Write a protein that binds this ligand. Structure first.
Ligand code: P4T
Lengths: 404, 404
């Protein structure tokens, strides 16, 4: 069947506003986490976040940006980067029924939803709301706001699956190539960063609260004293392309997507089962005839979640587990953007031949013993990498990417 | 290639709480639209809606429903109906890696996004927010809140695409069957009905405002004096199943999904382009060796949209129009739920041999000549039916369903 490769990438993240900045942060083990006065002022217990450090004012034409929330702004800038990186001209990708876009967010825009309700409840009613809230607040905002300006004619929709959102977007893009329906699908996602959404996670006890005075130490996957994830925002986009089409245009190919797992736990709303993760990893590895050299774990810095995933990894890999690191210890958890951003970090590791460190492990959890959790940047010629995304609601995605 | 059939359906709609009530409404041309004191009290200009007329108290177990917003409640009730209609025991669909769920909403839960923000700003802060808002508010709430209690082990995610949401969910379910990855996928969606979301549509001028004193006449697709859509809520679910699997278990089969189009306009953000719809319909018709007997139009009762779709229909079919009716004149526009609900109305027409009327056309639009818009219930043996969903943001889905 038809093979899918990644031929371009773009990213706006807590650890860099393009792939050059991201690569430098990954190699340096640099945290993207900062103290947030906004989260503190809202009354939250978690006062830290992985913010995008970019003035986005003016970067997008007004006729386009007027429809957008921050998730769409970050995804749009990532898409522009990905198109440039792929070397795609408008003649090639615009008004082309074989070019699609599958990109989502986990939350839509709580900020604009709340803005609309607050405005409506004041004396000016509909006049205060204005005419742009639907495209900002709707769950499909990220795909809708990008498909128009980029003149996409093929598929156009958003997948959402909480932390797995943009990993399922990439896997669905692979499926469109496999079905022969598309030659290129831009795949990815975006997530805004705001107290309106963050407080929902803090209310469920999911966020880190004990390290507000030392923000760079709060996200600490696998450390014995981890206490929840650090919320983040941003976007990412990859160009998923059919192999013969890529070769025919002289594309730069980062990797082939040689496996895509998607499963469901059917168990707990907010905690992973393990069993679903084992099936998801095995599905992504089926038929893949090379070992996993590096695994970018879901690893959010939660007491239960981090070790549930490690137990699943031990079950999948038996006595030959891969090198592992949790890049969320540097970046935080960007929710709908995490799958694509972590696919990109993994592709940069593959392209540049290094493993990024799993930072802030002052005392390794007892349940991580015996695994090669890499804690210092390591040069290594990688061939095959895996990235896990295990979302709330028991939804799992795994991607396996390999050099061609 | 593996073939996909529909073996069960379930629905909670403005025109009925199960398929018996929906069938009777469709045959009678009975409006589901009522006056809404909630919309009026909120300051809106549109005071009409297609509400679900059902007391849902106690229909879902407390430990299940505590995670859910109304979109999930309606989708869950629809799924229970679909499972019973498909004759699936718990042992047949639970804990089964070959059984999946793809179901979404257009808006998630504006009500619970606003609830979380309002609670956080009050005297109890995080304690008033409570631990259930993420599962209510997140874009994937509908899939997350159903996949756990129904013990789904296969695919699990949401697609969102505004009006096309649950039609793309059904098409993607068909793709899982075609790829050989699933034997059954429950596909559908839900949408809450609330001023928090409705006011955003009224603020952009999208909703009907001139007919509040006569709610049943507000939604009037193709009428010269239409003035916007009437917002609605509800849910729907279909059981998409691989053909040989269905036959081997003695399933009742409504129809095969013989075509699925998904395209993008890539054009004016706020209006349908017409051309994307043409491409979508032709994609869904490709290889289908029988004529389209009946078309359930997207037709939302908007000035621009209704006649753009008619022009696309003329381009596709020339002088050989199928019979057409816009069931939204009865039901209103249930946004994320519209694709699956309209697929279900189309399946009921196919199963029971009639065309539902396009109601409230007192003066046919000057631009609607030369087609077969059916305005009176008409008994007729149908074989192949089409349903269009042309979503805000230029995202299109079309489904073609045919008797076996
Ligand atoms: C003017 C129109 O016809 C429409 S249809 C529509 N649909 C949805 C559905 C679900 C989420 C967002 C938008 N929005 C508008 C403004």
């Amino acid at each position: 069947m038809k093979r899918a490769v990644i031929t371009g990438l773009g990213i706006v993240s807590s650890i860099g506003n393009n792939q050059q900045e991201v690569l430098a942060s990954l190699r340096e083990g640099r945290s993207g986490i900062t103290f947030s006065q906004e989260l503190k002022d809202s009354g939250m217990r978690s006062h830290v976040w992985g913010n995008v450090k970019l003035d986005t004012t003016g970067l997008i034409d007004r006729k386009v940006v007027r429809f957008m929330s921050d998730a769409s702004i970050y995804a749009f800038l990532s898409m522009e980067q990905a198109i440039a990186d792929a070397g795609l001209s408008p003649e090639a990708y615009q008004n082309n029924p074989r070019v699609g876009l599958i990109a989502g967010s986990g939350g839509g825009s709580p900020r604009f939803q709340v803005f609309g309700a607050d405005a409506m409840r004041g004396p000016r009613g509909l006049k205060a709301v204005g005419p742009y809230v639907v495209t900002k607040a709707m769950a499909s905002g990220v795909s809708a706001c990008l498909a128009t300006p980029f003149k996409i004619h093929g598929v156009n929709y958003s997948i959402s699956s909480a932390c797995a959102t943009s990993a399922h977007c990439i896997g669905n893009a692979v499926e469109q190539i496999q079905l022969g329906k598309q030659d290129i699908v831009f795949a990815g996602g975006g997530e805004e960063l705001c107290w309106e959404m963050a407080c929902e996670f803090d209310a469920m006890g999911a966020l880190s609260t004990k390290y507000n005075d030392t923000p760079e130490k709060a996200s600490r996957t696998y450390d014995a004293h981890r206490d929840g994830f650090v919320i983040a925002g941003g976007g990412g986009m990859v160009v998923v392309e059919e192999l013969e089409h890529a070769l025919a245009r002289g594309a730069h190919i980062y990797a082939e997507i040689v496996g895509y797992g998607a499963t469901s736990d059917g168990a707990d709303m907010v905690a992973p089962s393990g069993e679903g993760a084992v099936r998801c990893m095995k599905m992504a590895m089926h038929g893949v005839d090379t070992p996993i050299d590096y695994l970018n774990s879901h690893g959010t810095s939660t007491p239960v979640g981090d070790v549930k995933e490690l137990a699943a990894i031990r079950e999948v890999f038996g006595d030959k587990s891969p090198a592992i690191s949790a890049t969320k210890a540097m970046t935080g958890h960007s929710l709908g953007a995490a799958g694509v951003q972590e696919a990109i970090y993994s592709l940069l590791m593959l392209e540049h031949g290094f493993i990024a460190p799993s930072i802030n492990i002052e005392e390794l959890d007892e349940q991580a013993a015996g695994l090669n959790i890499v804690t210092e940047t390591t040069d290594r010629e990688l061939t095959t990498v895996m990235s896990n995304s295990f979302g709330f609601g028991g939804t799992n995605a795994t991607l396996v990417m390999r050099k061609l």
